[PDB]
């Protein structure tokens, strides 16, 4: 729609028809994923630094949709697509199979049971 961004849920942040919401409730990774799902979305995925540039400015730490396969240490998004080196820099801390977004397209591995704020996203269709 010319000059407009959406459709998005009410009060969500919109950029290039991607919808974001920054939730201040502290939840486990699993509870955060369930919250996003209940609102027809998923946890934050970084698909493009260029297209999601403003997210470089988001401070603090928030659950995002990045999960580990401990068997060989690889990481992928909830949707099954692989983590790409040009999407974000992952700072690995020996214990933890989930990751928080931490500004500047960096993520930090974190125990999935930890309580964090979280970011949901609906990708533009």
């Amino acid at each position: 729609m010319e000059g407009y961004c959406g459709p998005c849920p009410n009060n969500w942040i919109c950029h290039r028809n991607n919808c974001y919401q920054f939730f201040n409730e502290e939840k486990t990774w699993n509870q955060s994923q369930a919250s996003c799902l209940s609102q027809n979305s998923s946890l934050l995925k970084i698909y493009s630094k260029e297209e999601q540039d403003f997210l470089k400015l988001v401070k603090s730490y928030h659950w995002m949709g990045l999960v580990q396969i401990p068997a060989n240490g690889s990481w992928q998004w909830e949707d099954g697509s692989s983590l790409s080196y040009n999407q974000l820099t992952l700072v690995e801390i020996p214990k933890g199979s989930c990751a928080v977004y931490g500004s500047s397209f960096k993520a930090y591995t974190e125990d999935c049971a930890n309580l964090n704020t979280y970011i949901c996203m609906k990708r533009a269709v």
């Binding site: 401070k59 603090s60 690995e92 801390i93 500047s104």
Partner: protein, 146 residues
């Protein structure tokens, strides 16, 4: 010795507009110097995280006038999981320490403990102290090897 970073956060004045300064040493050798006024890999790793931390500390101090000194001490890891000590001094009055290894705290007295408890409620702040170490541990180790 260890890698040591000394941070100062203060109110700028007409006589000196500096509000933060960061000086990282290994023994006597100064290896990184930052401030709002005006070794390559480790300098690169540390720079933005320290600037970001100083900005957070400024906001914390604003909600606490007060002068703040912070000392970070990072020993070479060896085979151990990388750890550091963060020492805080608010206006030469309140003193407390954070240990990243087990995310534990120690205050000099109960008055310091009150402020410490307020500060550590800030989950972002505590993450920044821990995360800086894991982000730059390898490059700090590498340099300390040199």
């Amino acid at each position: 010795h260890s890698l040591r970073c000394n941070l100062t956060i203060k109110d700028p004045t007409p006589a000196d507009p500096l509000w933060y300064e960061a000086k990282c040493f290994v023994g006597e050798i100064l290896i990184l110097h930052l401030s709002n006024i005006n070794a390559t890999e480790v300098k690169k790793c540390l720079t933005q995280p320290l600037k970001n931390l100083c900005q957070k500390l400024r906001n914390k101090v604003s909600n606490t006038y007060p002068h703040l000194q912070v000392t970070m001490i990072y020993p070479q890891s060896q085979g151990r999981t990388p750890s550091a000590t963060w020492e805080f001094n608010i206006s030469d009055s309140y003193f407390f320490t954070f240990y990243t290894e087990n995310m534990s705290w120690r205050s000099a007295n109960d008055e310091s403990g009150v402020i410490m408890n307020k500060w550590k409620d800030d989950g972002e702040f505590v993450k920044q102290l821990k995360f800086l170490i894991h982000e730059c541990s390898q490059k700090m180790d590498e340099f300390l090897k040199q």
